[PDB]
Amino acid sequence: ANEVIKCKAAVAWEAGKPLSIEEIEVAPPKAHEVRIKIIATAVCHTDAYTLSGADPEGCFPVILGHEGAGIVESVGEGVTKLKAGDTVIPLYIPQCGECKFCLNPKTNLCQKIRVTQGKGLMPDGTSRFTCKGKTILHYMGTSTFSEYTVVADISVAKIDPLAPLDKVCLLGCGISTGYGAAVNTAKLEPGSVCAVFGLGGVGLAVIMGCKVAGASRIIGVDINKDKFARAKEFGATECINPQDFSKPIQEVLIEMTDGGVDYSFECIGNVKVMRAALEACHKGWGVSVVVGVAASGEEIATRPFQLVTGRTWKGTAFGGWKSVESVPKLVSEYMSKKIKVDEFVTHNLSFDEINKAFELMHSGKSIRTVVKI
Amino acid sequence: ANEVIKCKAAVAWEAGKPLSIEEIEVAPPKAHEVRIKIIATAVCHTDAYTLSGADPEGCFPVILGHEGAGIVESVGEGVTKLKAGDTVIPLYIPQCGECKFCLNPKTNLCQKIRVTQGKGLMPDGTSRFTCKGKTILHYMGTSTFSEYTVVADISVAKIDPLAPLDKVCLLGCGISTGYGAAVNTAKLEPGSVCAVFGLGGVGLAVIMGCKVAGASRIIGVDINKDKFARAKEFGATECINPQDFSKPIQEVLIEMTDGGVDYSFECIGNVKVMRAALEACHKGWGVSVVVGVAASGEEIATRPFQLVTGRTWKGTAFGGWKSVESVPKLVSEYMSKKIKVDEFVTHNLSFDEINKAFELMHSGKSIRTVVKI
Ligand SMILES: [K+]
Ligand SMILES: [K+]
Ligand SMILES: [Zn+2]
Ligand SMILES: [Zn+2]
Ligand SMILES: [Zn+2]
Ligand SMILES: [Zn+2]
């Protein structure tokens, strides 16, 4: 029978502090749960946001991480679609396929287990993690910063067994989110003129998506010009640094596109840039998609005139992908060379050096650092 | 040859004062212009707004009015599509049919004459109105509060000769705007749950559109319960007065619809209500359409979280209808009984009593007052 597993995990004991590599215990999977051996994981801006303590919903102690890939170690009772050995990717956006959201083609926001997930617990209201006599919380239903994690059986995507996990773990959030923002949320048409604010992992994926969709122009926008080279490699036709201008960035974009862009994407999480992204859109048919997650309490604003005269304000979560059915297809698109993933990896580290990944992100030198468990 | 015409018109010499019935001179139609004999007109909230003086770009003196219907009296050089005797409706939203906007299926905001129109002038930068030696400005390119008006030849919809002008003049703005907001901007699907804020002419037209689209639930929202009866007559499944609840109206609507509405429409021009309308929308797929025009400088706001979790913020102008090609079709839908127009008329007055139409505006079980020229 499935026994308790003693392994290593990067525990976040408290907000504002680095992660600590600890010996933890991972309980066996209960009914409709799956225990996964994490092979590779990466750090997303969101993991850092929660660790900072700025997240009102953040609770400690906790095992963070939501971009990962591994192998099913064991399954709980009732689980038949998955078995030991299956290659998988943990999902923070599950897909029960039965709730009103899963049944509605216009959304991917399954609500079946959100309450418990928000509390860092499995669907039955308890955690499978313990460390030095203390209960350790789950995070985003995935907790990938551990040699072994337990997730709800609806939070699992079974993928191509030949997929390189040290690469597809990135489809766990960043890449999928930006890519989906373009082809799912915006559904931009061939020839579209697009602007992408923020040239990090998500922004690059948006550009990637705009290129796949056939955009005629893709303008990258970032104050850090060191991000331009890679942005162009991904498809950006040109990049502009807001600091090189003495007028609001939206005015710059309107000027260089004769009215504004057809589609804009904010991939930073800055409400001011969000307003700018909307206002840089063309009158009559422009559409701006909010992809980044802004700090709590912060509000976006603009004059209703902007909407009345034709612009549309949208947002997206995990690129609008119905997770369980989509993630496997995204992996296949990677395997068939339709989308890029390898190009997103700028650094590689061992599990013990996971804090360097946070350091590299904060310093803005990297796009994605893959951590080998 | 076309002579100067001496006729009656309701002139607004200054803001805050009643319109004055004056005897004016209407110059003949210059190149690509059309002089129309106005048979019937009505007052829209926008006319009242401009007259109030609370409008920054509102100039004086001016001949207001933009909801009208009449007959072509004469046309200027180069006009071949229209001729004396044609039955028409003046358009504040043109359709030159050649600009980037007119050629784009996603918008109806022709820009060919926007600049001159905003200045109360014809395309050539001059006005065709004079009174007591003073030049009188045009308004919204229509100036229907006159026995005769002159408009750009692209601001004309040629309609069914059998149409009752004392009725279809309302298709000049109010009805068409609300109706189009539902079927063009929202494009709501059968069975949709809707909420309409503001139960005036525009609001009722939105309700009408929701019913035509097959909406299942249509909740009218207004602080004036006197507007509910007619709202139900037009199709509202129920009406609620925000003042009857302690909780913010969006929370009330979310509770009533188990999550929020599929589509909301703000038909008041209040940024606070626009925010409530958006937040009253269901997670994952809710859409809110701003139909009302807010006061200058005022802005709408919300937490980006609302968009990231699936809601969309939109707006509309004249219901998104390509004016010249759509108005004739709308007249035909009225003639074939697909939509209502007669039910919007709550009062009838003579031209000299036009000021009462404005008095009736500031309150009531009054929707539209048709002024017989
Ligand atoms: K689209
Ligand atoms: K729709
Ligand atoms: Zn993430
Ligand atoms: Zn579900
Ligand atoms: Zn045009
Ligand atoms: Zn109007």
Q: What are chain A's domains?
A: 1-177+317-373 (3.90.180.10), 178-316 (3.40.50.720)
Residues of B in contact with A312 (CB under 8 A): 312-314
Residue A88: beta bridge partners? Answer: A70, A158
B254 CA distance to ligand 6 centroid (A)?
Answer: 31
Q: What angle do CA B252, B257, B261 make, to 5 degrees?
A: 90
Cα separation, A134 vs A72, whole angstroms: 26
* Alpha-carbon gap: A153 to the closest alpha carbon of chain B (Å): 23
What technique determined this structure?
Answer: X-ray
**Tokens describing residue A209:** 């998506």
Inter-chain touch B303–A290, beta carbons under 8 Å: no
Task: Return the residue matching tokens 């279809």.
Answer: B168
**Tokens describing residue B367:** 């929707």
**Tokens describing residue A271:** 């409400």
Cα separation, A323 vs A93, whole angstroms: 6
B284 vs A104, A309, A313: nearest CB:
A104
Which amino acid type is present at position A77? E
**Tokens describing residue A215:** 């955009």
Cβ–Cβ under 8 Å, residues A91 and A141: yes
Cα separation, A259 vs B243, whole angstroms: 42
Q: Residue ranges of B for the binding site?
A: 44, 66, 96, 99, 102, 110, 173
Cα separation, B260 vs B194, whole angstroms: 9
Q: Among candidates B61, B51, B67, which has minimal Cα distance to B130?
A: B61
Residues of B in contact with A259 (CB under 8 A): 100
Q: Is B368 a residue of the active site?
A: yes
Cα separation, A184 vs A186, whole angstroms: 6
* Alpha-carbon gap: A287 to the closest alpha carbon of chain B (Å): 10
- Give the torsion through C-alpha atoms of B110, B9, B21, B68, to 10 deg: -60
Rounded alpha-carbon distances, angstroms, from residue A227 to A236, A273, A328, B27: 11, 17, 29, 62
Q: Among candidates B170, B182, B168, B175, which has minimal Cα distance to B211?
A: B182
Catalytic, out of A173, A194, A239, A281: A173
Rounded alpha-carbon distances, angstroms, from residue A72 to A75, A147, A155: 7, 12, 12
Tally Cβ neighbours within 10 Å of residue B346.
15
Contacts of B145 (CB under 8 A, 6+ apart): B9, B10, B19, B41, B47, B63, B64, B65, B354, B371
Residue B370: beta bridge partners? Answer: B42, B348
Q: Is B281 a residue of the active site?
A: no
B65 three-class SS: coil
The resolution, in angstroms to one decimal, equals 2.0
Q: Among candidates B168, B166, B162, B139, which has minimal Cα distance to B327?
A: B168
Rounded alpha-carbon distances, angstroms, from residue A144 to A5, A20, A174, A319, B97: 15, 14, 15, 20, 57
Which amino acid type is present at position B59? C
Cα separation, B7 vs B148, whole angstroms: 7
Cα separation, B172 vs B66, whole angstroms: 7
Q: Provide the total of helices (H) and of strands (E) in chain B, helices listed first.
A: 12, 18
Cα separation, A342 vs B362, whole angstroms: 65
Question: DSSP letter string over B133-194?
Answer: TEEEB--TTT--SBSEEEEETTSEEE--TTS-HHHHGGGGTHHHHHHHIIIIII-PPTT-EE
Question: DSSP letter string over A245-281?
Answer: -SS-HHHHHHHHTTS-BSEEEE-S--HHHHHHHHHTB
Q: Please name which ligand lies nearest the alpha carbon of A285.
A: 1
Catalytic, out of B35, B66, B275, B282: B66
**Tokens describing residue B358:** 């404005």
Catalytic, out of B102, B131, B169, B210: B102
CB–CB contacts below 8 A, A to B: 115
Tell me the CB-side half-sphere exposure of residue B286, using CA atoms within 13 A. Answer: 26
Question: DSSP letter string over A207-248?
Answer: HHHHHHTT-SEEEEE-S-GGGHHHHHHHT-SEEE-GGG-SS-
Residue A371: beta bridge partners? Answer: A41, A349
Cβ–Cβ under 8 Å, residues A24 and A9: yes
Cβ–Cβ under 8 Å, residues B348 and B356: no
Cβ–Cβ under 8 Å, residues A264 and A280: yes
Cα separation, A179 vs A265, whole angstroms: 11
Question: DSSP letter string over B248-283?
Answer: -HHHHHHHHTTS-BSEEEE-S--HHHHHHHHHTBPT
Cβ–Cβ under 8 Å, residues B173 and B51: no
Q: Is B362 a residue of the active site?
A: no
